[PDB]
C-alpha cells in the first residue's frame, strides 16, 4: 500500500514509516516488473524472504532519475548528503521505478523540494525538515534580497516533454536492523501440502520430527500447540494451517 500510495513525501522531508508485526512479500516485490531499479546491498532479494529481521524502516521520497545512482550506500552528492544520507554499512535494498506519468504534469511540479544549500553533510538516517529561511546565515537580519545567503529548498523542474532522465523516479530505501529484540516483521512462510498415512519427514513450527502422521482422536486445549508422551517424546501435533 505504501508503494501504491498516491501521496509521496519530498526528498528533503522524506517520510519515515516503522513497519512492525506483519509479513512482507519480498519474493513478490522482486518479481514485480514495474521497478526499473532494484538494488539490494545487505541481503540478496532471493534470500531476503528466508532472512528474518525485527524492524523495517521505509523512506518514501521522489527524486530526479539521475540521482538514483547517488542514492546508494557509501555515495556522495547533493541528494546523497544534504537531504538523504546512508550509512557505509548497509542492510537493505534500494527500489526505483519510472514515475513520469504518475506525478509529472504539464505544469511545473513544485510540490517536491530539495536541499540545494547546506552548511555540512548530514548523518545517515537523519532528516532536516526545518525550512530555515537562509542557509548561510551571514547576517541575522533576514534580508529578502539575500546576497551571501539563499533558500536551501528549491522546486524540482518536472516536465514529461523532456523524458531524458530528469524525469522523477520514485525511490524507496529499506533498512533492516538487528536490535537484539524478538522479530516483528519476517519473511513469508512457505507451507507445503500436508500428506497423511505416509512416512514423511515433517517440520511443524520447528518440531522437525520424522514419522507418519495420522488423523487423531485426542482433543487439545485451544491454546495447546502439540502433544507429548510419558517419556517426553512428541506423539501429537496441531496442524497450524
Amino acid at each position: 500500500e505504501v508503494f501504491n500510495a498516491t501521496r509521496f513525501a519530498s526528498v528533503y522531508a522524506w517520510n519515515r514509516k516503522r513497519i512492525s508485526n506483519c509479513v512482507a512479500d519480498y519474493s513478490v516485490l522482486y518479481n514485480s516488473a514495474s521497478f526499473s531499479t532494484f538494488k539490494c546491498y545487505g541481503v540478496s532479494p532471493t534470500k531476503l524472504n528466508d532472512l528474518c529481521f525485527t524492524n523495517v524502516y521505509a523512506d518514501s521520497f521522489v527524486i530526479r532519475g539521475d540521482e538514483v545512482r547517488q542514492i546508494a550506500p557509501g555515495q556522495t552528492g547533493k541528494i546523497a548528503d544534504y537531504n538523504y544520507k546512508l550509512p557505509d554499512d548497509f542492510t537493505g535494498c534500494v527500489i526505483a521505478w519510472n514515475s513520469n506519468n504518475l506525478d509529472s504534469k504539464v505544469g511545473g511540479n513544485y510540490n517536491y523540494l530539495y536541499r540545494l544549500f547546506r552548511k555540512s553533510n548530514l548523518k545517515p538516517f537523519e532528516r532536516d525538515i526545518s525550512t530555515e529561511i537562509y542557509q548561510a546565515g551571514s547576517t541575522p537580519c533576514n534580508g529578502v534580497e539575500g546576497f551571501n545567503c539563499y533558500f536551501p529548498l528549491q522546486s524540482y523542474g518536472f516536465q514529461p516533454t523532456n523524458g531524458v532522465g530528469y524525469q522523477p523516479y520514485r525511490v524507496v530505501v529499506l533498512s533492516f536492523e538487528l536490535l537484539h529484540a524478538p522479530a516483528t516483521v519476517c519473511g513469508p512462510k512457505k507451507s507445503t501440502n500436508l500428506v497423511k498415512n505416509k512416512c514423511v519427514n515433517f517440520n511443524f513450527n520447528g518440531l522437525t520430527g520424522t514419522g507418519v502422521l495420522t488423523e487423531s482422536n485426542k482433543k487439545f486445549l485451544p491454546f495447546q500447540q502439540f502433544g507429548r508422551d510419558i517419556a517426553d517424546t512428541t506423539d501429537a501435533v496441531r496442524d497450524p494451517q
Partner: antibody
Amino acid sequence: EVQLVESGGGLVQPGGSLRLSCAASGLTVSSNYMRWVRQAPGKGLEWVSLIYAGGSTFYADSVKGRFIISRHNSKNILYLQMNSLRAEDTAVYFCARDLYVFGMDVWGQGTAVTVSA
Amino acid sequence: DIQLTQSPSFLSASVGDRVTITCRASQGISSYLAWYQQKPGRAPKLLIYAASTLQSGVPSRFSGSGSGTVFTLTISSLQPEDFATYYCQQLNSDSSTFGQGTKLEIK
C-alpha cells in the same frame, strides 16, 4: 562588495605540484560551492573540478585522479592542488561562487599557468 | 555524457540588431542552462540563469527563450559594448560542461 582574486600561475615541470591560491572577500569557504574552470588560450571555458560546501569532491573525466582539491579554512582562501600535470593543461584557471542552480555570479581574476619542460 | 554545442559560433551584426544565439544540448537538460559573456582578457559574466530570467545587475535588453534541447539568447538592443564570447552551461548537473562559444563583432 565581493571580489575574488586568483593567483599562483607560473611555470612548472611535469609530475610537479603547485598550490593554486584564490582569495575571496565577503564569502565563507565553509558553506560555498567552490569550482575551478580553466580557459586555454584560443579556446573556450572547460570544467576542471568541483567541491561542495561540506566535501564530496568532484573531478572532470580528463583530469580524474590527477587533480586534488582541498580548500583551507584560514581566511576563507580557496586552494587547488595539482599533480601529474601535462603540457596540455596550460590555461587560465578561474574561481567560482556558491550558486549551484541560481546561476554563477563572479569568478576569480585568473592567471595563466604555463606547463612545459 | 551531456555535450553542448553552439551554432554558428561566428556571427557578425551591427548595433541595434537582434541576434539569436542557440545552444542545443545533445542531451536533455530541461531549462537548466546558463548564459555567460566572456569578454577578452577578462572573466565571464552571467546574463541568464536557469530558465529565462534576468540576473540582478544585467541590462534589461538581454532575454532568452526555449527549454529542453533548444535554447535561444535574444538581445533587443544590441549595444556596441556587448560583443564578447557567450557560453552555455548545465546548472543542475554534477559535471557542468561549457558550450563552444560564439563570437560577436562589428559588421
